[PDB]
């Protein structure tokens, strides 16, 4: 079930560093150590190699992304706006 | 999707072959040129 009520992945830090700091570290840590889907082959085979570098286990593609998650919201919106205004350049 | 689109421009294009007009001629292999 649940070995830890609240602390979660932050259980390796014990009682140290303070509750608020452990909470702040928790979300980014969960993002970082997670396994993400691959946009190129469609498999959940993408893991971080270093902060910003994400590699797919299958299809062996390395992509650049966020420090602790594959994509950032800023990058997603920049991608979408580039698409939109280049379409309007065409039109 | 955009990576695939990036490749499409340089490699063989079925849409461009269809736009060329002659289709069955190309299927029979009527146009041939040598480069390099």
């Amino acid at each position: 079930a649940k070995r830890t009520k609240k602390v979660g992945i932050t259980g390796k830090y014990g009682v140290r560093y303070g509750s608020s700091l452990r909470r702040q570290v928790k979300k980014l840590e969960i993002q970082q150590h997670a396994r993400y889907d691959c946009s190129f082959c469609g498999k959940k085979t993408v893991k971080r190699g270093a902060a910003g570098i994400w590699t797919c286990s299958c299809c062996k593609k390395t992509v650049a992304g966020g420090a602790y998650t594959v994509s950032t919201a800023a990058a997603a919106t920049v991608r979408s706006t580039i698409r939109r205004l280049r379409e309007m350049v065409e039109a | 999707i955009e990576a695939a689109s990036l490749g499409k421009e340089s490699l063989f294009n079925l849409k461009t072959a269809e736009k060329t007009g002659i289709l069955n001629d190309l299927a029979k292999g009527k146009k041939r040129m040598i480069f390099t």
């Binding site: 902060a51 910003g52 966020g66 420090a67 991608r79 309007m88 350049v89 | -």
Partner: protein, 176 residues
């Protein structure tokens, strides 16, 4: 190797030159990952490597187009005059020939405000918020520097600070 754009030449001034991304690698002391991009030397029959700063979305095996008439896609570098209103660039050249000076840190970019009639000038909003006018011939990579959100994670440990700052030139631990 330093992270610099391609040296300016006729191909990038008028048409486009196509390179391919070979690897996306980690640079010691730098937050942003680097991209190795191989181009064909227009004069000599030999391949030339370049070390760009990877933007978010750049991936191995991708085609990167550099020049005035290259597609407005993330990863492609363009003269600022070739891009429309409101675009977002990275590694922006301050002036033609410097090979990139603005918005090089992770998660940072430069927005385009508007162009100029009288000459080839463009104005831009820098990450801090300043509004600067550079030569419209200055190049930039489309997109945002990869590795964003890095500063959001607390270090939590003097040891993590030690490992971070031993690679930099900043003196650690600090005195005075």
């Amino acid at each position: 190797g330093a992270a610099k754009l391609r040296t300016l030449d006729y191909a990038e001034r008028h048409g486009y030159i196509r390179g391919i991304v070979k690897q996306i690698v980690h640079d010691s002391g730098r937050g942003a990952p680097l991209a190795k991009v191989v181009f064909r030397d227009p004069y000599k029959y030999r391949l030339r490597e370049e070390i760009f700063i990877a933007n978010e979305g750049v991936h191995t095996g991708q085609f990167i187009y550099a020049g005035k008439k290259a597609s407005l896609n993330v990863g492609n570098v363009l003269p600022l005059g070739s891009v429309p209103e409101g675009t977002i660039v990275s590694n922006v050249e301050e002036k033609p020939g410097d090979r990139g000076a603005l918005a090089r840190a992770s998660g940072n970019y430069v927005i385009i405000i508007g162009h100029n009639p009288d000459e080839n000038k463009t104005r831009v909003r820098l990450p801090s918020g300043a509004k600067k006018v550079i030569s419209s011939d200055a190049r930039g990579v489309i997109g945002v520097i990869a590795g964003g959100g890095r500063v959001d994670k607390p270090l939590l440990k003097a040891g993590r600070a030690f490992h971070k700052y031993r690679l930099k030139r900043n003196s650690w631990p600090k005195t005075r």
